[PDB]
Amino acid sequence: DNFVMPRQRAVTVERERQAGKQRDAYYVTQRVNLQRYFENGVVSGAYAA
């Protein structure tokens, strides 16, 4: 519960029709992050030495 993901723009697929080149371009963009309310709530373990 401590961690939460903020989001401004979700995953979107926008296609731009290039004409001089016959190809069609597909663009995918996203706006996300990962932040926690307070400076605690996660613990990690590591091998000795």
Next chain:
Amino acid sequence: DNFVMPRQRAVTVERERQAGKQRDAYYVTQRVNLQRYFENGVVSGAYAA
């Protein structure tokens, strides 16, 4: 009545979506000039010195 407005096209707005850049460029264009029939008809006063 000695001056004119030679105009080819009026004020026009244009909208283009540059999806590869994710902008929305706006273009405004017009064509005008200021001419007079004859080489006289104007007078302007200026400060001294």
